[PDB]
Amino acid sequence: QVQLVQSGSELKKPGASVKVSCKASGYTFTDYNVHWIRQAPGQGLEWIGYFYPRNGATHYNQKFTGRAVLSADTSVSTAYLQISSLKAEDTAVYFCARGETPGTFPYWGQGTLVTVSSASTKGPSVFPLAPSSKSTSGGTAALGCLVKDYFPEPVTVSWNSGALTSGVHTFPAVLQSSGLYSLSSVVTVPSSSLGTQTYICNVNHKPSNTKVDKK
Amino acid sequence: QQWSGPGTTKRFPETVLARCVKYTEIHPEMRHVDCQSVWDAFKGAFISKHPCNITEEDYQPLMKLGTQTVPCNKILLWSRIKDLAHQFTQVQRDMFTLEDTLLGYLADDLTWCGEFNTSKINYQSCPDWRKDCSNNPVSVFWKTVSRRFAEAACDVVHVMLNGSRSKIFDKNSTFGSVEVHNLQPEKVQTLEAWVIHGGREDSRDLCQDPTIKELESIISKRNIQFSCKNIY
Amino acid sequence: DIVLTQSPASLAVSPGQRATITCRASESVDNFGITFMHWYQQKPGQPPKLLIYRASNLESGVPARFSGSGSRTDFTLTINPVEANDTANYYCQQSSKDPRTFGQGTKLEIKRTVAAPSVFIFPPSDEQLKSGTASVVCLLNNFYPREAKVQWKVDNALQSGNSQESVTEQDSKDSTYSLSSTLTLSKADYEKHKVYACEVTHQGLSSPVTKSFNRGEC
């Protein structure tokens, strides 16, 4: 089946050059175009410019001219984008997009968050947000994991190694007064299963390589 | 050589610049191209050459500056009539043809000539194909673009073939010269060639008529399919 | 460019009723028999699945609830049987000229009859009190249709400046909001006081419920 897969999130410095790479699977690479489309967070969408992989024929938007240099590889079937000499206002989400013509976009990649700052990455710390010691709620008891201190944004706390999905109430990574991000991934679970099934929360922060666990 | 033909039409670079400007205006193209530079590569393809000494490698800078991905399966081969081929692609704009391609939309219904000595358009006279020589650059361009379009054709072909002549399928056309040799039967399987009873038919036993029976005699020794639906 | 602005800024429709998310172009995008107006539905945590493109064509795989009418000036997107899983942004996008700028979006939300909160409170852990700062949370549920705030009471002395708020988005089936609110004192200001209660308020409530716990006696 036709699909697309693009590269992961990147914390850039001011002045650095982004290099997003996609990968086209399910279809022959020489037939259609590989567009790029921005999303600044909480904002609207913004077109960059599209590559033609049949003979290398590029076309940019008038604002991004010179900064954007599209390329590809016809053998490995990977599309590209490069924006260089970055700065702090340009933090956004980019997507690779295939259209049936220019002017439509049916098929997409999954998303790439690029963040421009100068500070260092901070791995998170976990806290067992303990359940209610006055244990009177019927079957609506809850325990959680107070997670603090991200410098880069995206995390997907796996809680019980992915299995825990029902009850998981994860909050947005909201910037705390200190200056990092923090949320409170909790679990609304049956009071019986709260004491029975051990709730080993396992977090996942990919730019720090941090994989800690807590019951 | 030069003479005994209708020459180049009036307003040649303005109609070349306008025509494909309508192409980058209406179709959002997979590269927005320099319509001016298209005409400079067209000028360098044939200008101030000997009309009956034009080969196919003179036109490939234009063909590599007009590289489309003409959708396969949705294709149409035409022959003989132009007005009913125009009506059949106006009912069949889903199935893209040579009057819907970029290069056909550039040089559709145009003829060009040029005197050998210096940089001028020969506006008055023209090398005819039978009467002077069949190496004129208009037939060179139509041979090159029908070769590329019939090679990249695929799946199901739907040829319209009129029968108003006594020869329904003549051998010496561009159809029976390059199109039916490079129909490429590894991707094409079934060939619903659609014979027309318009005009004056040569014989009865339609679809047992002899030239379409010669095309029903399969040229491919893999023996890919032939079919013949009629239009009454 | 062509600049396009989306004329309803928000919506709040209960399911079974209809909605209309329109936009207005500055000039004609409809030239030579083509109009270019392509709507795009984007749920959060999801790149936009394509909707009505060239102002008529519903794409295969999309439900037939959607009916979009494009023109040279007026571009409606009406959804007559709206469902609970439609909580998304609905962008518009032209492609007539070579600038291909989008709209800016419209936050469609789903109107639901206002539930009661279920308040929880959690004291900070022993690893929290041995690691430095401390943090008391007031986890709610079904509580934030843009209504109101928690209110902190530290030994009946209010403590502002150090109380954040984090709202989750609307759910896909039951439409459940919730809210964390931490209070980040030091070790000394946590060990200065005894009662650490919080007083929420809701439109779905009729009394301010105040959960509480003593300092280290839970």
Q: Which residues of B touch A79 (CB under 8 A)?
A: none
d(CA C24, CA B40): 41
| CB-CB contact of B180 with B218 (8 Å) | no
| CB-CB contact of B142 with B112 (8 Å) | no
Q: Which residues of A touch C165 (CB under 8 A)?
A: 174
Tell me which of A3, A94, A129 to substitute to probe the interface with C (most C C-beta atoms closer than 10 Å).
Answer: A129
d(CA A130, CA A145): 8
CATH of domain A125-214: 2.60.40.10
Structural domain of residue B131, as residue ranges? 1-69+97-152
| CB-CB contact of C187 with C129 (8 Å) | yes
By the 10 Å C-beta count (0-12 exposed, 13-18 middle, 19+ buried), C17 is classed as: exposed
Q: Do C47 and A146 touch (CB under 8 A)?
A: no
Extract the tokens encoding A106: 């049916």
d(CA A5, CA C1): 31
B132 and B117, same domain (yes or no): yes
Q: Do B30 and A31 touch (CB under 8 A)?
A: no
In this complex, the chains that touch A, judged by 3 or more CB pairs closer than 8 A, are B, C
CATH number of the domain residue C29 falls in: 2.60.40.10
C8 and C104, same domain (yes or no): yes
C205 and C133, same domain (yes or no): yes
In B30-68, which positions are buried (b, 16+ CB within 10 angstroms) versus exposed (e)?
Answer: bbebebeebbebbbebbeeeebeebeeebbeebbebbbb
Query: At a CB cut-off of 8 Å and minimum separation 6, what does B40 contact?
Result: none
Extract the tokens encoding A118: 């100068």
Please say which residue of C81, C110, C139 terminates a domain: C110
| CB-CB contact of B6 with B128 (8 Å) | no
B106 and B180, same domain (yes or no): no
Q: How many domains does chain C have?
A: 2
Find the residue in C nearest to B24 (Cα).
C98
The DSSP bridge pattern shows strands B194-196 and B160-161 to be parallel
8-state DSSP, A89: G
Q: Does any CB of chain C come closer than 8 Å to the CB of residue B151?
A: no
B83 and B105, same domain (yes or no): no
Q: Where are the domains of chain A?
A: 3-116, 125-214
Q: Does any CB of chain C come closer than 8 Å to the CB of residue A130?
A: yes
Please say which residue of B152, B171, B187 terminates a domain: B152
Work out the angle between the directed axes of helices B35-46 and B12-26 (0-180°, nearest 10). 140
Residue C88 falls within a domain, yes or no?
Answer: yes
Residues of B with active-site annotation: 72, 154
B123 and B49, same domain (yes or no): yes
Find the residue in C nearest to A49 (Cα).
C100
B40 and B76, same domain (yes or no): no
Q: Does any CB of chain A come closer than 8 Å to the CB of residue C205?
A: no
Distance from the Cα of B26 to chain C's closest Cα (Å) equals: 7
Q: Does any CB of chain C come closer than 8 Å to the CB of residue A99?
A: no
Examine domains A3-116 and A125-214 and report if their fold is the same: yes
Residue C28 falls within a domain, yes or no?
Answer: yes
d(CA B19, CA B108): 10
| Beta-carbon count within 10 A of A44 CB | 19
B86 and B116, same domain (yes or no): no
Extract the tokens encoding C179: 């809210």
Q: Do C59 and A177 touch (CB under 8 A)?
A: no
> Given in angstroms, what resolution was this structure solved at?
3.9
Q: Which member of A108, A128, A178 has the closest CB to residue C125?
A: A128
Residue C188 falls within a domain, yes or no?
Answer: yes
Q: Do A55 and B27 touch (CB under 8 A)?
A: no
Q: SS in 3 state form for B109-125?
A: CCCCCCCCCCCCCCCCC
Q: How many domains does chain B have?
A: 2
Q: Does any CB of chain A come closer than 8 Å to the CB of residue C138?
A: no
Q: Which residues of C touch A144 (CB under 8 A)?
A: 122, 137, 139
Distance from the Cα of A73 to chain C's closest Cα (Å) equals: 24
8-state DSSP, B178: I
B78 and B57, same domain (yes or no): no
C130 and C99, same domain (yes or no): no
In this complex, the chains that touch C, judged by 3 or more CB pairs closer than 8 A, are A, B
CATH fold label, A3-116: Immunoglobulin-like (2.60.40)
Q: Which member of B27, B28, B30 has the closest CB to residue A52?
A: B30
d(CA B73, CA B71): 7
Task: Provide the number of CB pairs (under 8 Å) joining chain B to chain C.
Answer: 7
Extract the tokens encoding A103: 């002017």
Extract the tokens encoding A151: 């410098």
Give chain C's contact residues with B (Cβ, < 8 Å). 31-32, 34, 95, 98
| CB-CB contact of B95 with B194 (8 Å) | no
Q: Does any CB of chain C come closer than 8 Å to the CB of residue B32?
A: yes
C132 and C201, same domain (yes or no): yes
d(CA A11, CA A91): 10
Give the SS3 label for residue C110: strand
d(CA A58, CA B81): 39
Q: SS in 3 state form for B66-93?
A: CCCCCCCCCECCCCCCCHHHHHHHHCCC
Q: Do A43 and C122 touch (CB under 8 A)?
A: no
B1 and B75, same domain (yes or no): no
Q: Which residues of A touch C105 (CB under 8 A)?
A: 43-44
Q: Do C34 and B26 touch (CB under 8 A)?
A: yes
Given its phi and psi angles, is residue B197 left (phi above 0), alpha (psi -120 to 50 degrees) or beta? alpha
Give the SS3 label for residue A194: helix
| Beta-carbon count within 10 A of A192 CB | 10
Q: Which residues of A touch C128 (CB under 8 A)?
A: 127, 146
Query: At a CB cut-off of 8 Å and minimum separation 6, what does A125 contact?
Result: A147, A148, A149, C131
Task: Provide the number of CB pairs (under 8 Å) joining chain A to chain C.
Answer: 103
Enumerate the β-bridge partners of residue A50.
A59
Find the residue in A nearest to C167 (Cα).
A171
Per-residue CA distances from C130 to C95, C126, C127 (Å): 59, 6, 5
B148 and B158, same domain (yes or no): no
- Angle value at C-alpha A16, between A14 and A20, nearest 5 degrees: 125
By the 10 Å C-beta count (0-12 exposed, 13-18 middle, 19+ buried), B120 is classed as: exposed
Q: Do B69 and A30 touch (CB under 8 A)?
A: yes
Please say which residue of C110, C140, C162 terminates a domain: C110
| Beta-carbon count within 10 A of A150 CB | 22
Structural domain of residue C187, as residue ranges? 126-211
Q: Could you tell me how many residues make up chain B?
A: 232
B55 and B130, same domain (yes or no): yes
Enumerate the β-bridge partners of residue B33.
none
Q: Does any CB of chain A come closer than 8 Å to the CB of residue C172?
A: no
